């Protein structure tokens, strides 16, 4: 069944949960654009972040696990043949989001997979190195001008390499949903006070 593999596997949020997350992400993009902490550092980044990221996910929001490219991607077949992948296909999950983030290229949500969910994370250089398994897991909320969504995962890894050693620094804002951190280079992270739960289905997208 190699030739019948999807473009990618992942957790695809339901219609209702995709909308709840989309709205939460839009609220963040507008809160952030109007924080003077953010305004100060536009040299490093009025800018309306909602329009800036007006390359929309042409579909439901999702957390990709394995890019397969219909079986041409490296490791596509070994991922998809796993028993846990077959048995999880079509099943319902409630995933945890711990933070929202923005860079000059992407806007996203950080997904904190549990040990059990990591079984669906696929089995590196020096951007995922030293970080826990599955740290790349994210939901893209928007991309800038010419950016493709694969970039969102690389941007989150870069941010998390900072958080690793407390380079996150002191908070520069205390929003009702969490504290706001300026990581420099136009990088921003809202650490949510309480995790967001999103309902999703593990499945595959064929383009």
């Amino acid at each position: 069944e190699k030739d019948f593999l999807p473009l990618y596997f992942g957790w695809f949020l339901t219609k209702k949960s995709s909308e709840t997350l989309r709205k939460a992400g839009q609220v963040f993009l507008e809160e952030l654009g109007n924080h003077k902490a953010f305004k100060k550092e536009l040299r490093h980044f009025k800018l309306e972040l909602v329009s800036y990221f007006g390359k929309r996910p042409p579909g439901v929001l999702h957390c990709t696990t394995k890019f397969c490219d219909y079986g041409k991607a490296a490791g596509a077949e070994e991922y998809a043949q796993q028993e846990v992948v077959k048995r999880s296909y079509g099943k319902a999950f409630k995933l945890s989001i711990s933070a929202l983030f923005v860079t000059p290229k992407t806007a996203g949500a950080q997904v904190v997979l549990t040990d059990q969910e990591l079984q669906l994370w696929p089995s590196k250089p020096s951007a995922s190195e030293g970080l826990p398994p599955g740290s790349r897991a994210h939901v893209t909320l928007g991309c800038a001008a010419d950016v493709q969504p694969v970039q969102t995962g690389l941007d989150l890894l870069d941010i998390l390499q900072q958080v690793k050693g407390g380079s996150q620094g002191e908070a520069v804002g205390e929003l009702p949903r969490g504290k706001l951190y300026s990581l420099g280079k136009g990088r921003w992270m809202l650490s949510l006070t309480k995790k967001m739960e999103v309902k999703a289905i593990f499945t595959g997208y064929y383009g």
């Epitope: 219609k15 949960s17 099943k91 999950f93 409630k94 999703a200 289905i201």
Partner: nanobody
Framework: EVQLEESGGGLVQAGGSLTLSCAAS????????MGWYRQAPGKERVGVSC????????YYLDSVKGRFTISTDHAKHTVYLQMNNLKPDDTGLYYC?????????????????????WGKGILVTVS
């Protein structure tokens, strides 16, 4: 504020049939999911059957497939579980469940993940 009211359980001889019913009060919209979970002696609660009111899509635990049928009455906001050819292994506390997300709840998610709303449970004893 949603409330789930269960009925239809009790004692039945092996090979018999029961129909469980659960009425949901307090939902403000039609597009939600309802289903049934069972706790057998010594075991954790497990999804038995779930349904999406609008789509009608159904999930069945493999051990009940063919024997149990789930259905809804739209106007009455009630779900029904028709249990035929009952076996002693079907004994347990049966719990109605509902969830506001019809796509999530209609898949009978594991209780690890959960459902938004739960009934109190009704006993089915198959002798």
């Amino acid at each position: 504020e949603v409330q789930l009211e269960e009925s239809g359980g009790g004692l039945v001889q092996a090979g018999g049939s029961l129909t469980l019913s659960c009425a949901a009060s307090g939902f403000t919209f039609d597009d939600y999911a309802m289903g049934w979970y069972r706790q057998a002696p010594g075991k954790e609660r497990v999804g038995v059957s779930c349904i999406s009111r609008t789509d009608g899509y159904t999930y069945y635990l493999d051990s009940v497939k063919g024997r149990f049928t789930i259905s809804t009455d739209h106007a009455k906001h009630t779900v029904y579980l028709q249990m035929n050819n009952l076996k002693p292994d079907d004994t347990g506390l049966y719990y109605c469940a509902a969830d506001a997300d019809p796509e999530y709840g209609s898949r009978c998610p594991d209780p690890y993940y959960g459902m938004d709303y739960w009934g109190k449970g009704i006993l089915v004893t198959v002798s």
